[PDB]
Amino acid sequence: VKVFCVHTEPNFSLPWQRKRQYSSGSSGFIIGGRRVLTNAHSVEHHTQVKLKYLATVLAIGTECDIALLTELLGLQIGGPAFCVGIAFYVIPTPVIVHFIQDYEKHDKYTGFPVLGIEWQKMENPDLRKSMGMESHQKGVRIRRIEPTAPESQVLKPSDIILSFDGVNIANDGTVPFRHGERIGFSYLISQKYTGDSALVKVLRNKEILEFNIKLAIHKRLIPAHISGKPPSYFIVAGFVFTTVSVPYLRSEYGKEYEFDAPVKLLEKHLHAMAQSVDEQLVVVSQVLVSDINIGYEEIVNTQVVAFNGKPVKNLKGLAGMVENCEDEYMKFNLDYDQIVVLDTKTAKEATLDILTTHCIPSAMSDDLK
Amino acid sequence: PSMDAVVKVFCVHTEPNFSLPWQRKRQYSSGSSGFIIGGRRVLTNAHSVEHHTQVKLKKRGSDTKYLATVLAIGTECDIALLTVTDDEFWEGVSPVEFGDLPALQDAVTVVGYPIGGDTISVTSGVVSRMEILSYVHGSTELLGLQIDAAINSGNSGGPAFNDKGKCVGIAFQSLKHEDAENIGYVIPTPVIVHFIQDYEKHDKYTGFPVLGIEWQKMENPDLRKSMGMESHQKGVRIRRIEPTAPESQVLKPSDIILSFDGVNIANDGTVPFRHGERIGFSYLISQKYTGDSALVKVLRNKEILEFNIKLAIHKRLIPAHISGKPPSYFIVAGFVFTTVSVPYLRSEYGKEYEFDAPVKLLEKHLHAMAQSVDEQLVVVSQVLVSDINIGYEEIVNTQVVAFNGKPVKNLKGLAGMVENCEDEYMKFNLDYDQIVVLDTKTAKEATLDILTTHCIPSAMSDDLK
Amino acid sequence: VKVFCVHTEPNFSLPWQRKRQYSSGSSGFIIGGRRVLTNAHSVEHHTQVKLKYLATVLAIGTECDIALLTELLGLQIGGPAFCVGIAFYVIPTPVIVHFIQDYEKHDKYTGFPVLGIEWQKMENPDLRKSMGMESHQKGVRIRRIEPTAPESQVLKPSDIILSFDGVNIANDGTVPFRHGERIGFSYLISQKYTGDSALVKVLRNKEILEFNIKLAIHKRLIPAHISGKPPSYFIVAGFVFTTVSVPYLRSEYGKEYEFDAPVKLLEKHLHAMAQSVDEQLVVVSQVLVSDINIGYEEIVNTQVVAFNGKPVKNLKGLAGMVENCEDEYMKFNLDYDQIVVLDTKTAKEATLDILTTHCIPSAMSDDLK
Amino acid sequence: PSMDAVVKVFCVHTEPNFSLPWQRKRQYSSGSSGFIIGGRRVLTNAHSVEHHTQVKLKKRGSDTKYLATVLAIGTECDIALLTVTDDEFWEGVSPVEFGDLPALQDAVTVVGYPIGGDTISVTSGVVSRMEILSYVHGSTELLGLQIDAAINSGNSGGPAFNDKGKCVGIAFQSLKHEDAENIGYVIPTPVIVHFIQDYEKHDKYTGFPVLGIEWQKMENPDLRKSMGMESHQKGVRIRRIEPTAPESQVLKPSDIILSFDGVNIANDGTVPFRHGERIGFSYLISQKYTGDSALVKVLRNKEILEFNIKLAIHKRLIPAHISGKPPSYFIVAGFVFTTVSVPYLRSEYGKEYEFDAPVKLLEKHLHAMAQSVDEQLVVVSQVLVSDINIGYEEIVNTQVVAFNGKPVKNLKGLAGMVENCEDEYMKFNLDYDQIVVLDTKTAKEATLDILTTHCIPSAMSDDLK
Amino acid sequence: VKVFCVHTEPNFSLPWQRKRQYSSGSSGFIIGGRRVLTNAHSVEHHTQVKLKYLATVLAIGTECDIALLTELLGLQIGGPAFCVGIAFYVIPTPVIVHFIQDYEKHDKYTGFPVLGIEWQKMENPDLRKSMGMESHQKGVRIRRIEPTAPESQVLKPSDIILSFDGVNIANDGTVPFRHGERIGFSYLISQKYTGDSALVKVLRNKEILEFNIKLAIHKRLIPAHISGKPPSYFIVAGFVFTTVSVPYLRSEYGKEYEFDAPVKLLEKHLHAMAQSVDEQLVVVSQVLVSDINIGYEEIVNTQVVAFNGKPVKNLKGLAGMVENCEDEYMKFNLDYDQIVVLDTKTAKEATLDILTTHCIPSAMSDDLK
Incomplete structure (x- = not known):
């Protein structure tokens, strides 16, 4: 479809102001259940929306740049696709389906959860041994934890994260993806929905603990x-x-x-x-x-x-x-x-x-x- | 010598948005040139301080910026009149002294500051021609000096001196010339005198009067004959008169203006100015003050009439x-x-x-x-x-x-x-x-x-x- | 065909003069009935014409830029076409056939008729109601009428034009064209021939009137x-x-x-x-x-x-x-x-x-x- | 000083179309330079006013354009002689005064106007060389001064002055030099004198006479021997003579021209001109008036003959x-x-x-x-x-x-x-x-x-x- | 084939000199009968020739730019062709075959003959009538004739050439070539061999004469x-x-x-x-x-x-x-x-x-x- 929108943007340098009214164009497409997908920026600060007419704005998925009428998975290759995703780069369907299902079950956009931790690789054998990691163990060391995250309680600095929902995390923070391809573990996390629980297995003072942690937005x-x-x-x-x-x-x-x-x-x-x-x-x-x-x-x-x-x-x-x-x-x-x-x-x-x-x-x- | 009196003008502006009239644009600072004259007074360009919310002044050899006061703004003549309360600013500087209207081809020196710079800049050239021009586009045309020198942003507003060290006016960057044409203008002393004397009498700027008429040349002999002009007579025909200048009452279309304040006007609208020099008759008008009256001699229906007319702004x-x-x-x-x-x-x-x-x-x-x-x-x-x-x-x-x-x-x-x-x-x-x-x-x-x-x-x- | 012409143009700045003789080239093609189509400008101010030889100029259709040896329909994509029109852009066959039939029935070129009116959209509901338009009614408001047109009589300013020859005119002045495509109503008008009659239905002071109006050139x-x-x-x-x-x-x-x-x-x-x-x-x-x-x-x-x-x-x-x-x-x-x-x-x-x-x-x- | 007499020349042209000879081209206006001289007279370039239908003149310090009269046109020397009926134009200006032919390397100042501009322009340089050149291509070659200064459109036609404030001729833009070569010409005073004196005597321009001959150098010794020249003799051989100049009668092919008006001509066609300076012999001819006679000494069949010949234009x-x-x-x-x-x-x-x-x-x-x-x-x-x-x-x-x-x-x-x-x-x-x-x-x-x-x-x- | 040649050119400005020895390269190809064709310029002023080795120079056809190891027919499109001629443009096989047959029957290159005349069109009807041309007659008027040609005798200025070897010459000096294509009559002439005879039919003082003329080089x-x-x-x-x-x-x-x-x-x-x-x-x-x-x-x-x-x-x-x-x-x-x-x-x-x-x-x- 051809998207036609009228925008009124805030001025961030002069926050009491709105920029001059302007119009734009982009693409999108009809999906089953009487809904249309398009870019989120192709309707940001909207005051009126038209399609090819008069449309309605149900939800804006900013992080995933989708609108229904922060590090997620993407493919480097509007208004998509051929359907293998959303043209941004191509924002893939595991992100798209997530967006729709998030709204369809919560009646609002609730973003993508993060674990709220910074981590360091455990590729050095001396580093591994000094923290009590047996040779078969792989994972990443927590550097620091967000004070405003729920897991700021149960997890601790220098914990070694071994797995997430039973999926093994490697020394480089990757997990298996497909045959001959791996991906960062945060992928697994961003596939969850806000408020979902997840099992995080860690090594603390040479002992294994598994925490059930509610996921939240950053x-x-x-x-x-x-x-x-x-x-x-x-x-x-x-x-x-x-x-x-x-x-x-x-x-x-x-x-x-x-x-x-x-x-x-x-x-x-x-x-x-x-x-x-x-x-x-x-x-x-x-x-x-x-x-x-x-x-x-x-x-x-x-x-x-x-x-x-x-x-x-x-x-x-x-x-x-x-x-x-x-x-x-x-x-x-x-x-x-x-x-x-x-x-x-x-x-x-x-x-x-x-x-x-x-x-x-x-x-x-x-x-x- | 006189370089101690040439100051740097720093101005903060808050401009209205004309496209979005409920908004003011972001504050910004611009720099230009100006100069100290007699009586704790400073001249600069009006445009340099348009929409000012604060003005500061800086002397060449000192870091100190001084808070200034805007006394009056003459937009039509592009002059701003400033003062400063702090006495330290005034002490030690010899104030600029004005000279007479320069002759053609006379040497002129323009002293000011470059753009984004706080060092003195010196530009040189000669007086090219006398001219009647608008300093703001679409506004009242005034006396001006066109000069050989190139005037740009930053140094406009600075004094222009003759070979005697006398100031012959204020530098003005051409609105109609690109910078590579090496053409500039100087707002001449009689206009500056007009502006200052206007302020000193009325405690405010009162503008420059116009005769609210449009005119047509009378260079064709038959046209002159058909309207009853005797052969020794010359002047211009009134095409149209501003309804909002009465004036509109006393003068009428197709009147032939023969003279203004006793000065004989030719068929091309010129009047004598100096030896071998002729200029447009509006110079006789723009030099008057608002409220002043002028004797206008016209030919109406083959008959001479004289009118004393109170002059207003346009x-x-x-x-x-x-x-x-x-x-x-x-x-x-x-x-x-x-x-x-x-x-x-x-x-x-x-x-x-x-x-x-x-x-x-x-x-x-x-x-x-x-x-x-x-x-x-x-x-x-x-x-x-x-x-x-x-x-x-x-x-x-x-x-x-x-x-x-x-x-x-x-x-x-x-x-x-x-x-x-x-x-x-x-x-x-x-x-x-x-x-x-x-x-x-x-x-x-x-x-x-x-x-x-x-x-x-x-x-x-x-x-x- | 290859068109070869000798031109003598007027000088519009010096109307007593003719510009220097010059020659040009263009394309065209043979049509049934011993006739050739080409551009009108490819023979304007002719004094001699040749084809690939010695040709004859029957009629010049300036407005439609056709010659037989002002806003009309065109297609944005000589000497045409492949036949889907005339290369100008492509001047389509509804315009071409019009040109030929105009001449073939009148022995001269008589242009394309216009209604001779300026009009305004009726998209605003308050505008519509204030003029007595029921919700099902669509059309456009006459702004002004050409004093030199015949319809300058029977039509009036602020008349709301509802239809032309029984074809419904929309609030944006468009009429249906094909499936999923619309076109300005003037298209219908330019398809008529000069002197043809046409039924124009209007709303005047909340009442419907239908006028039978002879069409003329602008x-x-x-x-x-x-x-x-x-x-x-x-x-x-x-x-x-x-x-x-x-x-x-x-x-x-x-x-x-x-x-x-x-x-x-x-x-x-x-x-x-x-x-x-x-x-x-x-x-x-x-x-x-x-x-x-x-x-x-x-x-x-x-x-x-x-x-x-x-x-x-x-x-x-x-x-x-x-x-x-x-x-x-x-x-x-x-x-x-x-x-x-x-x-x-x-x-x-x-x-x-x-x-x-x-x-x-x-x-x-x-x-x- | 002498800048008051340098005027702006405005000319309306109606040119024939040579390709379409039944047509005249559209009217257009061009501007150039000119200067006031003695006796209510104005000089400018001939080309500046070619095909004129109206000429106007404007002084530097006045807007007034004055209707002018074209007295005479010297196309070959590129001079136009103008006057003006209106006395106001003449009053107050000191007329340009002519000096002598400048020496080589003498300083020269060219005063005029730029293109599309009404302000005075001043160009400087020295005299490069004396030259015999055509001012119109294919036309009679005359005396001229080549100068170091660059002469362009607009300022050509203006006076050229020496260090004494005397005018040494009229500026002329080179036909054969591009503007970036900084080469210009000055139509010298003796040619101007020729043109004016010609007008004053005949009430019209009568052109510049030529000897209707082509010649060949006699620098080869055997060639000179074979034609009977004694060893002290020098000159040029006549190649061909214009049938339409008789002249054609009296002179014959292969005559050897030994001298002209008593002046000895060398084997290369040069004659002495001034101390250490030599120039082409045609300068002795072009300085005469049409109708004048000249003594031509030739060698014909090893014998000296003298002919008095009436000179005509080419x-x-x-x-x-x-x-x-x-x-x-x-x-x-x-x-x-x-x-x-x-x-x-x-x-x-x-x-x-x-x-x-x-x-x-x-x-x-x-x-x-x-x-x-x-x-x-x-x-x-x-x-x-x-x-x-x-x-x-x-x-x-x-x-x-x-x-x-x-x-x-x-x-x-x-x-x-x-x-x-x-x-x-x-x-x-x-x-x-x-x-x-x-x-x-x-x-x-x-x-x-x-x-x-x-x-x-x-x-x-x-x-x- | 790849041609390799060593050249010693004359200096035309200094005719007692030869330019410095230099080498070049070009293309060519083998033809039946133990012969190779190439450009003539690709072997001009040769002192030694090699192919891909040691070749021999039988004849140089300068005018036709062919070598065997002035206005002729050519095609605008080495070392040719695909065989439809010789790459120069493409020098066609009617020229090539001519070259070979000229040599093969004369043991030397004898160029291409010309008629040695300048001619003018007879397209104007008044011109035609004044010279006694009936309406069915076509041809061209002899302007001038080469004093050094044999035909300088038998032909005369203002003769109107009507035909050559029974082929009709048109008012524009063209003859038929193929269906819908014509060519200048000199084509027919250049197809002949030096010394060949040819029948030239002319109109002289309103009478027809046919001359049998031996053709020669210009x-x-x-x-x-x-x-x-x-x-x-x-x-x-x-x-x-x-x-x-x-x-x-x-x-x-x-x-x-x-x-x-x-x-x-x-x-x-x-x-x-x-x-x-x-x-x-x-x-x-x-x-x-x-x-x-x-x-x-x-x-x-x-x-x-x-x-x-x-x-x-x-x-x-x-x-x-x-x-x-x-x-x-x-x-x-x-x-x-x-x-x-x-x-x-x-x-x-x-x-x-x-x-x-x-x-x-x-x-x-x-x-x-």
Whole structure:
């Protein structure tokens, strides 16, 4: 089919804005049961959809780039296929069938689960022996575990993962796939559905334990996307506070953001884990220049670590602290050992005129109400 | 020598989005040139500081950037007048001193800064010609010096000096010349004097007056004979007069303008200027102040008449600029109504707008006169897609001519007619003989969700509330 | 077949001239009944024709670009085809058969009829209801009607056209074509022959009326072409008066004329309709410089609106008024509120020498005799 | 200083079409340079105003364009002499004053205008060499100054000044040099003086005389011995003499020209010119006026003879130009007969015509002398296709040699022979041993419809009627 | 086959020289009767030939570019073919078979005969009637006839050639070839063998005559080539006299010689005919600079028309006159009305040293002995 869509995208650099309305085209195809598959991006931020007419958007599978009208299996070779998958590369039918069945049994898209662990190979014999692995044993060593995953409890660093649902994991983290072909074990995991259980066999202090672990979706400190939700922001005295996500980084620094973005932010993009369920990377995005913030106008994309001596955990938390602040001064500890000091009464009184100058509807996005 | 007074101008801008009039664009900083003159004052280009939210100034030998104040903006003459509260900025610099209008082929030195650089740059050349030109396209034409030197971004706004170290005006980058043509302009001292003296008297910029007329040459002998001109008489015929300049009252079409403030005007519209030099008669007008009066001698029905006429600024149907104000807009049921101005057209169709914009709009931009002080060209800018407007989604930049039988004069009128609509249906008469029809009740109800979808703060700009 | 032709083209910028003789080549093919089809442009302004020899020109179908030795149906894919049409794109056989049958029954080319109306879609439900359209009714609203068409009588602005010869017209102005394909209703109209009748069903003030309307060819204010006829001109005192057509515009301003031509003329090219059968856009084409016209030499392509207080309707009309003018002065009201004034006796006496200087055979083209 | 007198020349042209001699091309305007001299007079290039129908002049500091008058045109020397009736044009300008012939390597300044521009341009260089050259290709060679400076379109026609502010002539863009070679020419003051003095005496341009001879160097000693030259004698041998210059009477082939007006000519055809400088002897001839006489000393049969000879202008079989006149043409039955000139060849074959034109024509262009004052090269230019001329349609640019047995001398003769043809058949003897045969009665009858088809006003140019 | 040849070419600009030895490669093929065909140029100026070895050169067919180990028929499409001819373009088998049979019956190559006439079409009816051609008669009018051809007798200018060996010649000089294809009549002529007779039917003064004419090879004033013979030259006092041929022109002025060569020479190349069997175009090629010829050194490629009052007919003739000259002076009339005068005794005495300086073996080529 020929897909015709009207899009209204958020501006991540100016989160109170929507980009100009525009239209696009792509392909897709009819599947049994009165449903149509197409790309997820071929309908992202939709306001109206047509096919060749008037269509309906049931679910968006962002991670798998499918729409029904993060590392998954793909084939390197619209609007597919010949059916052997979805044209992205070709997104294969084990991913497609997963998407449909996920929705068809849950009435919503619930993504693809991950184990929430980083791992290291056990190819060195001295490494293996020092951890009590007999010669017949294969697997991978847990480097670190996501604090926001359920398995953060039952699994431990330096556990050696031997198998998943009775499937043997090799020293290079691979499992058998077909005759003469192997695949990373995460494939097995991404084939499960969110909330499914799975048996993980590990070696801990030279002893075998098997855990029954409920699988969940990955919480990332700097989110790959925000599921078509609007980006959040908080403003006071012209200081624009927002949270770092990949779309923000892409909008701020372009296609080469993994090289051009500030190193402090890149480190957290590549290496940091959320220590808590609602932890976000809060930055001063920019400063909307005005008398009240004179001498501060060159602060750009810098993390806020604390407000009036108190740690900042997320955007909602920061916004709360600022509204409840009764102290004479507001003190923001920023990264690079910088501080921002503002007189509390005057800073709050300055916000409105700045909003008017930049046509911002209110001091914060609706999600911070 | 005089290089200590040539400053670097740093400006933060917050520009309106003319295509999306509810938005302001992202803050950005630009750099240009400027210079210190007498009385704690700094001159630079108006365009360098358009839509400013902060201006800073930096001297050549010091890192310190100083917070500045914008005293006045002369958009038509492209001059901004600045000052600085901090005294350390002013101490130690000898202020630029102005010289007389240079002769043709006189040597001129333009001092300023390159683009993205904080070191002094020196450009040289001669005065090519006197000219009457617009410093903003579509705006009032003023006296100007064309120079042999190449003026670019960054160094425009800097002083131009004669061989005596006197400043003969402000550098201006040509709007109509590419950089490889080595053509530049200097906003001359009498225009600068005009702008400053205007400020010093009125505590504000009051613009440059025009005679609101179009004229035709009288170089044909029979044409002159047929209208009763005696053989020693010369001048121009009035083609048309702006309804919004009266003026319109006293003067009439086909009058033959013989002279202006006693100065004899030739059949080609020239007047003597200096020894061996002739220029357009509008220079006699643009040098006056708004509110001033001028003696106009015309021939009407083979008879001489003299009129004393109060001169005003030009009112254009499609404005060359809107004085830094926010662009007006009104929204009902996803229909975005706005007015046509030059910034709008440029934003909609790019720099080539005078060739790419719809012909209906070009016609009115190139040829139409305002029939009243309040007249605006109102269009549907675009349609924000929703159920209420199914089937209209393709309407773009089309003039709204009438609402429920009543002619639309301007945006406030239209917004007013829509608020007070009691009829079952809203019926918009659009250009190309099109009609848009919306059920009044549901159309008004649909507006909120649409505003929300596109993050539009208000259904209308504050000027319409 | 291989077509060999000798051409003598008019100069539209200098209408008293013919361009230099030149020869061309194209393709075509034999059809039954001793006839050959080829392109119309592959024989335009012919003075001699040969095939592979000596051929004869029976009729030229300009609009359909066919010769027998304006929006019609075409196929985007000489001297055709394989037969599925005529190579232009491919001009299909419903157009070809029309051309042949038009001539074969009328002994001349009579073009393709149009309804002579501009129309607007009725896709909006509020628009439909306000005009009394029941939910099952489809069609298009008449925006404006050509004053020089016969149907300018019986049809009215804001009439909603529901059907043509019993064929239902949709809200987007389309009619069924084949299975899964639709086409603009004008297709049905262009399939008719000039002078044919057709039944047009309309909705007027919430009531259905059916009109039997004789179809005619489109009269355009600025003609797409002039059917191989010579361009007209009138001259006095070096002022060259002519009428605006597309070939004139193309000759004056080049291939990009719809952008480069003066805006006043473009507006009339795109948007004006003839208010009368013999209305032409008369302009001063140029001024042939000489004493009598001094001070006037920069007037180029500017409309003449009136002569001595009297409206100019066409070139013949202007020429008449100038010859009959007994007044002391000739006064031309031009566009841009310009006037041209000439002493009548001297201006007429000046014409001949100017003609001699530019080698112009007479003051006017033969059609103005 | 002297820049006030350097004017901009605006010219409207109506050029004949040499390929279609019944047509004039569209009007167009070109701009060039010129300068005011003494006595309400203006000099510029002849080519800048060729085929003029109106000329206007504009001073540097004034918008006003003034209607000018063309007094005289010296095509061979590329000079046009202009004046202006309007006194306002003349008032206030110091007229250019001429200096002497510059020495080699002397500094020269060329003042003029760029192409498509109205500002003063200043070009600098030195005098490279004295030269004898044609200012129109194929035309009489005159004295000229080659300069180091680059002269282009637009600024050619402007004055060239020495270091004393004196004008040393008129700028001339090289016909034989590309612009990147930085080579230009100056039409020197003695040639300008010649042209002006010629006008002042005869109330018209009378051209530049030539000795209608071709010559061969006498640098070989045996050749000199065999013809009786004593050892102190030097000069050139006459190869051939123009039948249309008598001259032809008095001089004879193989005469040895020893001197001209008393000036000793060397074996290479040079004569002394100034200290350490030698130039071609034609400079002694071209500086005379038409009608003037010159003493020619030759050696004939080992004996000295002196001849006083009246000098005339050069008559070329294929003219370098036809003095702005309309080209002649004659039409019968679609056969277009015209005459061959340089403009014809250039129009027919482009700028490379001396390599692309048919060899038969090149031969006569490069080598043939007119056998009589009335002789023209007559050709069939082309055949306008019609039934009467089936089978001849390919004939192009082919000389007509005879009509019904009688030799064709020129176009008027041919047109005459065709009008008075009483024979049943018209029989044209063409080049390449071709014949064209037409039935006299039907051929004449067919002419009208053909003229009508191609919008040809008359079967012949007015000069043949 | 793979042809391997060693070549020693003459220098036409320096006719006493041979270019440096070089080797080449081409293709060819074996034909019945112990013979091999190849290109003629693929063995021109041979000194040794090899095939894939040691071959023999029986005959060179220059005009037809064939070798056995001027306008002929060819096909536009080595070392051929597939056999449909010879790869040159493809030189067809009617030309090939001609070449072989010419040699096989004459033991030498005797070229292809021509009629030795220039002709004009008789397509115009008035032209035809004025010469007494009845409506059924077709043919071409003789413009001019080669003085050095046998038919220069029996045929006359303005004769209308009607047929050749009973084959009808059309008004455009064509004859039938195959169904729907015609060819120039010279094709029929070039198919004959040198010395063959042929019947030429002509119309002369409205009467039909048929001539039996022996066919011969074309003598050209400026020869297309010289059949692998060495170029001739005569020298005296440094004046190098030679004859103009195409190879000379090509060597003097390059590939564009028909544009770059002097016009006087081009005229004779394109338009002159030999008035006599042994007429050659004699030029001063160049002057080898030395005292005796001072003042003459810029004479290049200029025709000698006369020696001491006597017309120059050819190179041998000029050489004779100079050796027999007893007069005090030698006087050469050159083109452009130039003369060259030399003292006879001193000029002859000067020749030898000049020859030594330029390493020229003698004053003249061996053919002038």
